[PDB]
Amino acid sequence: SDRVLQLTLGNSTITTQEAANSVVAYGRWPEYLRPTEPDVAACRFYTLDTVSWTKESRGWWWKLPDALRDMGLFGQNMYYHYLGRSGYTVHVQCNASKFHQGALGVFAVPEMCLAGDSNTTTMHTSYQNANPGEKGGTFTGCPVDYLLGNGTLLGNAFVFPHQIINLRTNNCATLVLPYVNSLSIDSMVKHNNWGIAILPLAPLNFASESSPEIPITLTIAPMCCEFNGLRNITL
Amino acid sequence: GLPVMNTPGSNQYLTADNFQSPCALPEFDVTPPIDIPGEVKNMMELAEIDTMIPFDLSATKKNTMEMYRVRLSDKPHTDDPILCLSLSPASDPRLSHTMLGEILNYYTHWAGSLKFTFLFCGSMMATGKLLVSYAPPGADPPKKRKEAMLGTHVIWDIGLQSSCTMVVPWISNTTTEGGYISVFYQTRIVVPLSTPREMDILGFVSACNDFSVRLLRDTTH
Amino acid sequence: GLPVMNTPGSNQYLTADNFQSPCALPEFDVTPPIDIPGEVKNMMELAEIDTMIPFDLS
Amino acid sequence: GLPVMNTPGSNQYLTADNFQSPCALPEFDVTPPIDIPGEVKNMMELAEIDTMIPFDLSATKKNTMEMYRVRLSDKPHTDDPILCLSLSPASDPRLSHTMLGEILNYYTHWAGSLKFTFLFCGSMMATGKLLVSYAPPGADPPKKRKEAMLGTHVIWDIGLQSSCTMVVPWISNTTTEGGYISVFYQTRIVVPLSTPREMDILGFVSACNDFSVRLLRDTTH
Amino acid sequence: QVQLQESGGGSVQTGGSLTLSCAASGYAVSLYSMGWFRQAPGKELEGVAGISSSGVDTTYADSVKGRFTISRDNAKDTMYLQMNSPKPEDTAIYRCAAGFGLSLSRYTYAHWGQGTQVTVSSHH
Amino acid sequence: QVQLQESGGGSVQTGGSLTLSCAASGYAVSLYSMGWFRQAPGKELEGVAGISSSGVDTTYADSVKGRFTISRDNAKDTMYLQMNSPKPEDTAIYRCAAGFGLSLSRYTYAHWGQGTQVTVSSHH
Amino acid sequence: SRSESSIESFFARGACVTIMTVDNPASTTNKDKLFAVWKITYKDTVQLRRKLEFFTYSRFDMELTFVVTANFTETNNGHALNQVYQIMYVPPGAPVPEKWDDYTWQTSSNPSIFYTYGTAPARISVPYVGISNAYSHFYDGFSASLNDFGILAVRVVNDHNPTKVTSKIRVYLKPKHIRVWCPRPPRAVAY
Amino acid sequence: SRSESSIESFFARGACVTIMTVDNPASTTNKDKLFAVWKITYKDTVQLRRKLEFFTYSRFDMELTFVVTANFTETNNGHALNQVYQIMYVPPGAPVPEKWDDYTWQTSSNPSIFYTYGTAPARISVPYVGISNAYSHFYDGFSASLNDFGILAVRVVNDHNPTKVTSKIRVYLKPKHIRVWCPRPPRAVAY
């Protein structure tokens, strides 16, 4: 759209799309809990593993704060504080041309659980499999794609706040998610607040031969993060 | 004691009554709430949210990701519409599975207006004009372009925008015949150079302000 | 509880009583009426209407 | 009589109800009270009273006067703390037997803050510096002096005063892991001339203003 | 509900005349129009034939006109897909439930039947 | 609750290798660290040996290092106090329950076991 | 015009959650022994469950109604005097009873209600007894173990009678003053 | 925030104090003879006892609830008409009854309550009937003989029936408006 501006959260450099429509989760802004507040140190853009959107792809998914566990300062506070809360400015850009055709679906599922009608026992999946870090996870046609990986017919996946990266429109996704949970503060280590999933709405089709697939990018910034009780400084 | 007289209804439990009852835990520390965003008042709010209608429920395309991908295929100017849809929001398989539709399973009566939104899932370089139509109840599906075109129709240019919205006016339930919604090749698809001659479309229905409901029923097994 | 005393008539159903009763459907969408002409208040109104007496019953 | 209607709950006894009841002795000479000092309003008041934590529950030292005498013994600078304590006020044997702790047996939830007080039970002539530490939940017991020292610690000089108080901040119950409280030989004990090289210490935990409780349970046999 | 049950499919010498049926287990059989979709192994279920709401229109695919036939039974629910002279490509899996249209499965009458495999085998 | 039950004690010729056990009748056996306290007749129950929360650290008293051994069983609860070469002073009453530490009983894991008397007797 | 449609009337229904069975045998039958114990959940049923599951978070005052019907199992002309059933509501985290005998059964804390058969059904209410600010119908991660509203306990209060009387406790729940946060697409199929 | 925690809610519970047994025999059984007599104390039970014992002095309005269930002891098809039980509350220091016959049983002073089985349980209240300004849970010295709130007496009001009906009086006490002076460390073990 032109005239795009960069924002530097001290260390991080952006250069957005421009602005072209952003999304606020239930029209709410992240505000302080009414503690250890890092501010700029842990409230600065971190870039996750850029993944490859291929014809064959089923989708991708990440947990918050899980992904950003291995993220410098934010991750320290996270590991060094028993009690903790935060917000996130999800920014998923995917650049292609006027010779590519498809539609990306980025959803924000508070408590994004996956599979098992064994309500009797959930979590089941192992701690490591439930927390795949920055590298991320993928749906399969077990996160059954058309059931949001969770037994629920995807056609409704639009309940959660979302934007559609339609190739021929905006080549970006901008999602703001204030802190959601029953608790006022939380065990960041153990509990995942949000679930950023990105599934194909329209498939990837490219003209003749060009880019055999294209790339999608997740850089997210923590929004007003705080924590309770500084535990042992384990180095 | 004060003279009192017992009337019919005494000692009988009303499933949907409204009476005061004695509290099991006097003075309990009720944790107060917080402003967790996601506060709802009604169900209709959920229905005035767009929902991807799973149009294609063909043998294979029913119950997989293709149920949503209505392909613009290389065929002729066969006027039998690109898409056909019966406006029976609960009594039509494609509409009964919507967010809106699921709520319509929880009442016997629904009334007001709805709206169809189309996302063109083709190239920036690709163009064409399509036609969205709605023949209100009574009228039958308009089999030829002209027939639909004659009535309420919307000519939607691809090469100008990806977003098309056509609101549906007045309708009413008892869960037997309503309206129809249809898509037609006004023109046809213009492909620039060597670009995949078969791209798709995505439809999103959502309720209107005027849309509400009455008489609460269910279904569970 | 408040001292109360039960008197004769309790537990007995009067066919032509006038009591308040609990509602089966709380908050139901009662369709409001319209001015359909033909609103009557009493039966006598119907009686102050001419009627062809069938005199000849041979 | 006034038309009345009997609703569900009539004729049923609620163990924790709140109803008016008829009096067995009308006009009885109720002796009026006097200001006997010792008037309490709540239980928490009793919990914001210091209580000698019976730290030493060793085979012999459990259930005799020594359970309270944590000896400062002639050993080396073995950094495994002089005293160790798990902050599980009801789920920890040493804390479950306290005044505070006993009350914590009468609820399921307790929340707020607590405070540790130490009385140095050594000579006026004896000195040294000790270290009181609290690593909040998550953190494990800090096995070496340094590890505890790195975090919230209090260096307490014997040769300056006998009274040490370190308040504990934020915690919460469901009667599964909390914090830890520890004592370390910052320096070591300085004995003047020919004085008994093994004296003791006395610990007193008490609640903070912010400390309260919820959901009343029990246990009796 | 009209629940459609497909019959009439299998092996025939290339150049026969196979009539394929589809019983409507519902009242509004008089519903809408009708149809027959075939899908080759892994390929799409393209619109072969179609009849009207009454059982009057006759709409076929480019390959199948001239030979293929469709006729819905008013009285006895089922529509008859008569593949006059079946061929090697007519060795596709057949489905039914097309009321309100023809051409594409990208619409029609969503509530679809199961499937029946027709194998046009003439070589011995 | 983890309720500890002490086993492995008694008479041995001074200079043997007695392995002493202590079963944990509770889930959080993985609790904390562990240990073995001995008390001579009327004397104090000093900290002899200790293992970690996982069953990794090895901490002994000045007398007992080089010979004594401690190993908590993860799978089968009990910690093994192997008094390699027991001596006349190792003729003390042994106890267990030391999760969170070593050195002194003036702390550790309060909920303590009963007792077992080891008598290191070599003279005949 | 939108009313009956609102939250306070989406759940303003008295739906069964569970059906528990008790007995008063003179014989020794320790299986269905006098006591009945059930974990207060919505999870057992279907209807009420899906309804709540439209959302991820909730707060509701939890009322319960207990209609109790009985009968004589053995084909005998034997008799029985009218009975009483102590309904013990147990707030989350307490000792759960077994043998209808135990100390717990005297509670001194737990609210319990004695009911005499053949009258207006049993009724109580437990306000938002959430350990959090909301009841999360779903919770992603590791501690499934839901929220726990406690456990319901009913036994025959009267002593052993020559003629064995079997009863049933039909439990209904009206979640008065309910509030919900962030909706999910509802469960497509069955559980 | 401290509420439910306060005294007026530390004891705002209905805890059993005693379980007394009566009968209506046509036969001569002088042991469990018609009458039931029990010294109003908290001392018998456990739960309620320890609770009070947290303090040394008290004042409380003493309410009591009597749920009464019955049955037929002998394995017979015999019958019995609904019954009545006179509950005699006896204020401290009065003549204590024996044989359900005696003058005392007509009282003209003592408050008594007749109850007809199969209804809402029995209920009364006795305000602070302390001979002092407070009820000392402990008293050091010599006059153990506690305070005495009196004695409860129940019998079958109806005459002798061919079929012997045995009943039970479950007594509960809610010490409404309680006040306490100078606390002690509570009793470590059991009694």
Side-chain angles (χ1 to χ4, degrees), chain A residues 2-235, chain B residues 1-175 177-221, chain C, chain D residues 1-175 177-221, chain E residues 1-123, chain F residues 1-123, chain G, chain H:
Chain A
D2 186 21
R3 59 223 162 202
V4 37
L5 58 169
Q6 82 168 230
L7 309 165
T8 293
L9 285 59
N11 190 14
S12 63
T13 304
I14 314 174
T15 41
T16 59
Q17 178 283 154
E18 157 45 4
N21 63 301
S22 61
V23 168
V24 291
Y26 315 102
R28 283 284 308 284
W29 285 89
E31 68 172 26
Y32 295 89
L33 185 59
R34 309 298 182 85
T36 305
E37 299 184 4
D39 193 10
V40 293
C43 300
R44 56 162 296 264
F45 289 89
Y46 298 103
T47 298
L48 296 179
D49 293 352
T50 303
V51 288
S52 183
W53 191 40
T54 65
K55 293 189 177 297
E56 35 290 343
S57 303
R58 303 314 308 162
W60 296 265
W61 55 271
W62 295 263
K63 304 293 185 63
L64 289 171
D66 175 27
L68 307 175
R69 62 180 181 176
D70 304 336
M71 296 301 179
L73 302 171
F74 171 82
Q76 307 314 319
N77 312 348
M78 174 182 172
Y79 288 108
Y80 302 113
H81 302 94
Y82 185 80
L83 310 78
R85 59 161 292 174
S86 181
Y88 312 98
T89 299
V90 187
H91 201 89
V92 184
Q93 287 174 130
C94 183
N95 51 350
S97 65
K98 301 177 180 63
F99 308 87
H100 294 79
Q101 53 191 3
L104 290 164
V106 189
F107 319 109
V109 182
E111 308 291 330
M112 186 187 66
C113 309
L114 59 69
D117 297 11
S118 299
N119 301 177
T120 60
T121 303
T122 72
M123 57 172 56
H124 49 264
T125 306
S126 64
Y127 183 86
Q128 302 78 21
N129 283 356
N131 300 341
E134 61 180 13
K135 56 183 178 298
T138 63
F139 285 79
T140 173
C142 178
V144 285
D145 52 12
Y146 67 95
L147 288 176
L148 184 61
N150 49 50
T152 59
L153 294 172
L154 199 67
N156 298 325
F158 303 86
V159 292
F160 316 99
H162 64 282
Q163 292 186 20
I164 307 169
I165 298 179
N166 182 18
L167 289 184
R168 58 158 287 100
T169 317
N170 300 357
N171 299 162
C172 59
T174 320
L175 301 182
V176 177
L177 306 173
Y179 179 85
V180 175
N181 187 27
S182 59
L183 307 173
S184 297
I185 202 174
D186 196 347
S187 174
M188 287 188 173
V189 177
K190 299 180 177 180
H191 179 279
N192 292 334
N193 299 339
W194 292 93
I196 297 300
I198 310 171
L199 298 73
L201 278 42
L204 304 77
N205 293 331
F206 65 89
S208 176
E209 180 195 346
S210 310
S211 300
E213 39 65 29
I214 69 178
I216 63 175
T217 314
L218 293 69
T219 298
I220 306 171
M223 299 311 300
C224 311
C225 42
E226 46 286 326
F227 318 96
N228 288 353
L230 178 59
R231 64 72 170 270
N232 59 348
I233 190 175
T234 304
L235 303 167
Chain B
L2 183 70
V4 291
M5 190 177 67
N6 296 204
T7 58
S10 303
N11 294 27
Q12 71 186 29
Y13 167 79
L14 172 53
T15 50
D17 71 57
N18 276 338
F19 304 120
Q20 301 170 346
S21 54
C23 177
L25 302 176
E27 281 283 12
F28 179 78
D29 181 24
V30 185
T31 308
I34 52 178
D35 191 22
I36 339 163
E39 180 188 14
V40 286
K41 307 297 179 177
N42 197 350
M43 308 305 292
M44 282 290 74
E45 307 170 1
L46 308 175
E48 295 195 52
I49 303 176
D50 301 31
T51 40
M52 184 173 59
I53 313 164
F55 305 98
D56 202 325
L57 297 172
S58 67
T60 53
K61 299 180 180 183
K62 68 173 182 180
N63 308 1
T64 60
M65 280 303 297
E66 293 300 325
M67 57 186 171
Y68 309 108
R69 293 176 179 175
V70 183
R71 176 161 284 99
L72 292 294
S73 182
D74 179 18
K75 50 76 71 178
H77 184 66
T78 307
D79 298 32
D80 195 358
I82 139 293
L83 78 60
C84 314
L85 186 156
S86 300
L87 188 64
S88 295
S91 49
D92 178 40
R94 296 163 299 181
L95 289 172
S96 66
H97 290 274
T98 60
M99 179 62 180
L100 174 62
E102 286 296 351
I103 302 175
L104 283 52
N105 282 353
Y106 291 91
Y107 297 93
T108 306
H109 314 88
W110 59 256
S113 301
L114 312 174
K115 60 184 173 184
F116 293 86
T117 311
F118 295 93
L119 180 60
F120 184 79
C121 308
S123 67
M124 187 293 176
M125 296 316 193
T127 86
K129 302 180 191 299
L130 290 168
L131 180 157
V132 189
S133 178
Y134 165 70
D140 293 343
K143 279 201 170 187
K144 297 302 175 181
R145 187 197 65 178
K146 181 182 180 63
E147 304 298 326
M149 176 288 299
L150 295 165
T152 308
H153 63 287
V154 171
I155 303 172
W156 169 53
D157 187 354
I158 286 67
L160 293 178
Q161 44 60 219
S162 304
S163 54
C164 181
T165 314
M166 178 183 178
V167 175
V168 173
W170 210 264
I171 38 183
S172 187
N173 194 28
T174 299
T175 313
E177 184 202 10
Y180 306 101
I181 311 73
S182 60
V183 174
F184 284 88
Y185 293 104
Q186 163 57 359
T187 54
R188 73 164 199 88
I189 290 302
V190 328
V191 285
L193 181 47
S194 299
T195 177
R197 308 179 69 174
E198 295 182 8
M199 60 297 182
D200 313 339
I201 52 175
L202 300 178
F204 303 90
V205 67
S206 58
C208 304
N209 311 18
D210 56 20
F211 196 86
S212 58
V213 282
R214 74 162 197 172
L215 194 159
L216 175 66
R217 62 175 186 88
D218 62 317
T219 180
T220 321
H221 314 277
Chain C
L2 183 70
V4 291
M5 190 177 67
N6 296 204
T7 58
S10 303
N11 294 27
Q12 71 186 29
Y13 167 79
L14 172 53
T15 50
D17 71 57
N18 276 338
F19 304 120
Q20 301 170 346
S21 54
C23 177
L25 302 176
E27 281 283 12
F28 179 78
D29 181 24
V30 185
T31 308
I34 52 178
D35 191 22
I36 339 163
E39 180 188 14
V40 286
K41 307 297 179 177
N42 197 350
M43 308 305 292
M44 282 290 74
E45 307 170 1
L46 308 175
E48 296 195 52
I49 303 176
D50 301 31
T51 40
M52 184 173 59
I53 313 164
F55 305 98
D56 202 325
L57 297 172
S58 67
Chain D
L2 183 70
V4 291
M5 190 177 67
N6 296 204
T7 58
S10 303
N11 294 27
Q12 71 186 29
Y13 167 79
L14 172 53
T15 50
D17 71 57
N18 276 338
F19 304 120
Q20 301 170 346
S21 54
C23 177
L25 302 176
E27 281 283 12
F28 179 78
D29 181 24
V30 185
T31 308
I34 52 178
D35 191 22
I36 339 163
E39 180 188 14
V40 286
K41 307 297 179 177
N42 197 350
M43 308 305 292
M44 282 290 74
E45 307 170 1
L46 308 175
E48 295 195 52
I49 303 176
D50 301 31
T51 40
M52 184 173 59
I53 313 164
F55 305 98
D56 202 325
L57 297 172
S58 67
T60 53
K61 299 180 180 183
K62 68 173 182 180
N63 308 1
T64 60
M65 280 303 297
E66 293 300 325
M67 57 186 171
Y68 309 108
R69 293 176 179 175
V70 183
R71 176 161 284 99
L72 292 294
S73 182
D74 179 18
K75 50 76 71 178
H77 184 66
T78 307
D79 298 32
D80 195 358
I82 139 293
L83 78 60
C84 314
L85 186 156
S86 300
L87 188 64
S88 295
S91 49
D92 178 40
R94 296 163 299 181
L95 289 172
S96 66
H97 290 274
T98 60
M99 179 62 180
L100 174 62
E102 286 296 351
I103 302 175
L104 283 52
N105 282 353
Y106 291 91
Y107 297 93
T108 306
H109 314 88
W110 59 256
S113 301
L114 312 174
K115 60 184 173 184
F116 293 86
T117 311
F118 295 93
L119 180 60
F120 184 79
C121 308
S123 67
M124 187 292 176
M125 296 316 193
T127 86
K129 302 180 191 299
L130 290 168
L131 180 157
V132 189
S133 178
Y134 165 70
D140 293 343
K143 279 201 170 187
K144 297 302 175 181
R145 187 197 65 178
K146 181 182 180 63
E147 304 298 326
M149 176 288 299
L150 295 165
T152 308
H153 63 287
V154 171
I155 303 172
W156 169 53
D157 187 354
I158 286 67
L160 293 178
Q161 44 60 219
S162 304
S163 54
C164 181
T165 314
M166 178 183 178
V167 175
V168 173
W170 210 264
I171 38 183
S172 187
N173 194 28
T174 299
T175 313
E177 184 202 10
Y180 306 101
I181 311 73
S182 60
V183 174
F184 284 88
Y185 293 104
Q186 163 57 359
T187 54
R188 73 164 199 88
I189 290 302
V190 328
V191 285
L193 181 47
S194 299
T195 177
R197 308 179 69 174
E198 295 182 8
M199 60 297 182
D200 313 339
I201 52 175
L202 300 178
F204 302 90
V205 67
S206 58
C208 304
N209 311 18
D210 56 20
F211 196 86
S212 58
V213 282
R214 74 162 197 172
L215 194 159
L216 175 66
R217 62 175 186 88
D218 62 317
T219 180
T220 321
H221 314 277
Chain E
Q1 178 202 337
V2 319
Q3 188 181 6
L4 285 154
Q5 179 54 12
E6 306 174 13
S7 54
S11 176
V12 67
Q13 173 278 159
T14 299
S17 192
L18 297 183
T19 303
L20 320 194
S21 302
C22 177
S25 302
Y27 55 101
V29 51
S30 54
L31 47 261
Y32 291 78
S33 190
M34 273 292 87
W36 288 93
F37 292 86
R38 69 178 185 181
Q39 56 159 133
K43 300 74 176 184
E44 291 185 351
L45 54 180
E46 184 197 20
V48 180
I51 200 172
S52 71
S53 59
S54 185
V56 170
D57 81 39
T58 191
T59 50
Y60 312 111
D62 71 331
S63 56
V64 306
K65 328 84 49 56
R67 62 178 189 274
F68 282 54
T69 307
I70 183 174
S71 59
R72 102 163 220 273
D73 201 343
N74 310 337
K76 312 303 298 300
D77 67 19
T78 178
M79 45 299 306
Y80 311 94
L81 180 65
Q82 187 199 37
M83 309 170 62
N84 179 17
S85 299
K87 296 174 184 60
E89 284 68 42
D90 302 356
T91 307
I93 326 164
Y94 292 80
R95 302 80 178 7
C96 160
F100 188 146
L102 168 266
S103 308
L104 302 301
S105 184
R106 275 43 64 188
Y107 57 87
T108 62
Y109 202 69
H111 45 121
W112 226 263
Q114 194 66 318
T116 192
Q117 170 65 3
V118 172
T119 305
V120 190
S121 60
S122 56
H123 199 83
Chain F
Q1 178 202 337
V2 319
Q3 188 181 6
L4 285 154
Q5 179 54 12
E6 306 174 13
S7 54
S11 176
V12 67
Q13 173 278 159
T14 299
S17 192
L18 297 183
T19 303
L20 320 194
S21 302
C22 177
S25 302
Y27 55 101
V29 51
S30 54
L31 47 261
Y32 291 78
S33 190
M34 273 292 87
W36 288 93
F37 292 86
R38 69 178 185 181
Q39 56 159 133
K43 300 74 176 184
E44 291 185 351
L45 54 180
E46 184 197 20
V48 180
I51 200 172
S52 71
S53 59
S54 185
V56 170
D57 81 39
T58 191
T59 50
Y60 312 111
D62 71 331
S63 56
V64 306
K65 328 84 49 56
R67 62 178 189 274
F68 282 54
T69 307
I70 183 174
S71 59
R72 102 163 220 273
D73 201 343
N74 310 337
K76 312 303 298 300
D77 67 19
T78 178
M79 45 299 306
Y80 311 94
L81 180 65
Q82 187 199 37
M83 309 170 62
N84 179 17
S85 300
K87 296 174 184 60
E89 284 68 42
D90 302 356
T91 307
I93 326 164
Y94 292 80
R95 302 80 178 7
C96 160
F100 188 146
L102 168 266
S103 308
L104 302 301
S105 184
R106 275 43 64 188
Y107 57 87
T108 62
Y109 202 69
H111 45 121
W112 226 263
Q114 194 66 318
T116 192
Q117 170 65 3
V118 172
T119 305
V120 190
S121 60
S122 56
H123 199 83
Chain G
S1 59
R2 55 181 64 182
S3 58
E4 198 179 30
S5 50
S6 66
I7 272 60
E8 288 191 359
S9 297
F10 178 85
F11 302 94
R13 278 62 198 172
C16 171
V17 299
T18 182
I19 302 176
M20 294 165 61
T21 300
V22 297
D23 57 2
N24 186 14
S27 180
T28 307
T29 307
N30 295 359
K31 179 185 177 298
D32 294 358
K33 188 205 297 176
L34 312 193
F35 66 94
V37 177
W38 170 86
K39 184 173 179 292
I40 308 170
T41 183
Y42 50 91
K43 187 172 184 177
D44 277 30
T45 50
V46 282
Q47 295 177 154
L48 178 59
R49 197 177 189 186
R50 198 177 191 276
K51 286 176 61 179
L52 295 171
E53 292 187 342
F54 266 95
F55 309 97
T56 316
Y57 298 94
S58 63
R59 291 176 64 94
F60 61 89
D61 312 358
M62 187 191 63
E63 175 185 326
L64 301 171
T65 300
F66 318 90
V67 178
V68 181
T69 69
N71 56 332
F72 310 91
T73 52
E74 58 183 5
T75 307
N76 188 12
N77 300 164
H79 295 265
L81 290 167
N82 190 14
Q83 296 175 330
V84 172
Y85 314 105
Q86 184 182 12
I87 308 178
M88 290 190 172
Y89 165 76
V90 184
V96 178
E98 303 179 359
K99 318 174 189 303
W100 69 280
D101 312 344
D102 57 30
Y103 75 97
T104 58
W105 213 272
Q106 295 300 335
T107 177
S108 66
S109 288
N110 308 20
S112 304
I113 315 171
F114 292 84
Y115 183 85
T116 314
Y117 177 84
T119 45
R123 170 170 291 192
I124 37 65
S125 301
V126 190
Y128 178 85
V129 287
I131 52 180
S132 304
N133 304 36
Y135 290 113
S136 302
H137 298 102
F138 300 93
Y139 160 82
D140 196 29
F142 293 83
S143 185
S145 184
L146 287 51
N147 291 332
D148 183 32
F149 312 105
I151 56 285
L152 291 175
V154 193
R155 68 163 183 180
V156 174
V157 181
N158 310 40
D159 308 5
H160 304 275
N161 180 43
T163 308
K164 183 180 179 180
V165 175
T166 302
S167 306
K168 290 187 175 182
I169 314 75
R170 287 178 176 84
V171 189
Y172 292 81
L173 191 175
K174 289 190 60 188
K176 55 178 182 179
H177 302 86
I178 190 172
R179 296 182 58 175
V180 286
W181 299 269
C182 296
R184 297 192 177 190
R187 170 80 175 192
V189 288
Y191 308 87
Chain H
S1 59
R2 55 181 64 182
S3 58
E4 198 179 30
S5 50
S6 66
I7 272 60
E8 288 191 359
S9 297
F10 178 85
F11 302 94
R13 278 62 198 172
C16 171
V17 299
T18 182
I19 302 176
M20 294 165 61
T21 300
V22 297
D23 57 2
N24 186 14
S27 180
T28 307
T29 307
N30 295 359
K31 179 185 177 298
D32 294 358
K33 188 205 297 176
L34 312 193
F35 66 94
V37 177
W38 170 86
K39 184 173 179 292
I40 308 170
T41 183
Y42 50 91
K43 187 172 184 177
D44 277 30
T45 50
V46 282
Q47 295 177 154
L48 178 59
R49 197 177 189 186
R50 198 177 191 276
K51 286 176 61 179
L52 295 171
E53 292 187 342
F54 266 95
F55 309 97
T56 316
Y57 298 94
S58 63
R59 291 176 64 94
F60 61 89
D61 312 358
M62 187 191 63
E63 175 185 326
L64 301 171
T65 300
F66 318 90
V67 178
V68 181
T69 69
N71 56 332
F72 310 91
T73 52
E74 58 183 5
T75 307
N76 188 12
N77 300 164
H79 295 265
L81 290 167
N82 190 14
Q83 296 175 330
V84 172
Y85 314 105
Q86 184 182 12
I87 308 178
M88 290 190 172
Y89 165 76
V90 184
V96 178
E98 303 179 359
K99 318 174 189 303
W100 69 280
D101 312 344
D102 57 30
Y103 75 97
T104 58
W105 213 272
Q106 295 300 335
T107 177
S108 66
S109 288
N110 308 20
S112 304
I113 315 171
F114 292 84
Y115 183 85
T116 314
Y117 177 84
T119 45
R123 170 170 291 192
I124 37 65
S125 301
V126 190
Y128 178 85
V129 287
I131 52 180
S132 304
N133 304 36
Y135 290 113
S136 302
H137 298 102
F138 300 93
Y139 160 82
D140 196 29
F142 293 83
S143 185
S145 184
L146 287 51
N147 291 332
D148 183 32
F149 312 105
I151 56 285
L152 291 175
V154 193
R155 68 163 183 180
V156 174
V157 181
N158 310 40
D159 308 5
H160 304 275
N161 180 43
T163 308
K164 183 180 179 180
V165 175
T166 302
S167 306
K168 290 187 175 182
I169 314 75
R170 287 178 176 84
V171 189
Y172 292 81
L173 191 175
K174 289 190 60 188
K176 55 178 182 179
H177 302 86
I178 190 172
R179 296 182 58 175
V180 286
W181 299 269
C182 296
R184 297 192 177 190
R187 170 80 175 192
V189 287
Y191 308 87

